[PDB]
Amino acid sequence: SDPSSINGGIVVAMTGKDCVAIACDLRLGSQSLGVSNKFEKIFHYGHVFLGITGLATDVTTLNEMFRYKTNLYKLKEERAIEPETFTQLVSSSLYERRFGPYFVGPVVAGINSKSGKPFIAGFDLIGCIDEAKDFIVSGTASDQLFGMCESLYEPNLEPEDLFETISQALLNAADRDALSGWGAVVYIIKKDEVVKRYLKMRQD
């Protein structure tokens, strides 16, 4: 019935001191049946990272669409798209399908290559921009993630500390949702380098 509750999955993004983090679970299910334990929900177009929750076919479709649009952007502009600009592209792209929308909860994370300023943003399925300085949450365990983030989070965390905070926010939220979990991956994004880590979590 509810396309946002068929496949399951979660994404969370957080800002630290001259860094951002975006994390997601690996579950792809069909209602109660778990199907895949390797379905990643975070993609990157240059230095801009996009996490997508909701109906899995639309997650895959939007990934292919934004790769398409960012590839054309780069050829015309002769530079990589910035998080703030990409956020506006996602917003206008989703509102284009206002009366037939993609059943998704996108999350943009990245560092503006020029200003060095950490940036995150969230959207509803029709592309209303939610620009928060602290954290963004999305998926079937959004209530849980909101609770964990609102408690655990403090401003200006170092990359190594921010990793522990986002990891614990995701893991504990996922273990209170039937349709989330089955493994998790965390992205620690800095100006120069980006570290990707797979978390050991409960396989139930």
């Binding site: 015309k76 502009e77 530079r79 600009t85 506006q88 592209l89 917003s91 206008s92 020029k114």
Partner: protein, 250 residues
């Protein structure tokens, strides 16, 4: 009724010439002189307000037009052709960029969109090319200041400085002497006014000269305060008074 002209009116001649484009460039050459000079910290575009009657009010006719708050345009050739190109250029900046990315297009891309419109008038059924050459001066965060020429063919090239129309050959020669990669914006306005004096026959003052700059942000011209990121438009048209002030130090 119905446009039965579904065929090209611009075709290759046995010599390999595109007649209607060549004839369009001829119409541009007859047009009043206009020029553009790029400084280190700005760009200047200037033309002569050739009043068609002393009863006519030269102020009610803008040869220099704002496309975006950071991009300006001037022309040589057919005025009406320019006017509708400015209207289309302003709209395509919104439909094809601002309504997608939530920011104004960079100079090179808006130039690229104007170039396309003029190329289509070269190939589409039942139309003639545009009888104008544009000089588009603009600023964007990642390219800085830039100056482009756009021809009836749809071709466009970036310039440090150039001129188009009547006395373009002589004006381009004078700019080659005076231009360096260390010019300040005030020096470029001074050089622009010198170059344009050689083109103008009659009265040479702020009421007969139309000149605009792409320079620093004008927070006084924004019209609102309270958004730090919004610092105002880089495009400013110089007043009749502001030109005359610089003409006494000629």
């Amino acid at each position: 009724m119905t446009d039965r002209y579904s065929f090209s009116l611009t075709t290759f001649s046995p010599s390999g010439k595109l007649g209607q484009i060549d004839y369009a460039l001829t119409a541009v050459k007859q047009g009043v002189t206009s020029l553009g000079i790029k400084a280190t910290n700005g760009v200047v575009i200037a033309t002569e307000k050739k009043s068609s009657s002393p009863l006519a009010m030269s102020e009610t006719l803008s040869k220099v037009s704002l496309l975006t708050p950071d991009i300006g345009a001037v022309y040589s050739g057919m005025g009406p052709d320019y006017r509708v190109l400015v209207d289309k250029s302003r709209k395509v900046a919104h439909t094809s960029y601002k309504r997608i990315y939530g920011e104004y297009p960079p100079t090179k891309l808006l130039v690229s969109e104007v170039a396309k419109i003029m190329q289509e008038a070269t190939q589409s059924g039942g139309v003639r090319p545009f009888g104008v050459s544009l000089l588009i001066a603009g600023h964007d965060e990642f390219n800085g200041f830039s100056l482009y020429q756009v021809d009836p063919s749809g071709s466009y090239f970036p310039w440090k400085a150039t001129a188009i129309g009547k006395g373009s050959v002589a004006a381009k020669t004078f700019l080659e002497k005076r231009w360096n990669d260390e010019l300040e914006l005030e020096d470029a306005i001074h050089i622009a006014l010198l170059t344009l004096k050689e083109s103008v026959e009659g009265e040479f003052n702020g009421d007969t000269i139309e000149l605009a700059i792409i320079g620093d942000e004008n927070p006084d011209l924004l019209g609102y305060t309270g958004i730090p990121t919004d610092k105002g438009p880089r495009f400013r048209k110089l007043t009749s008074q502001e030109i005359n002030d610089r003409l006494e130090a000629l």
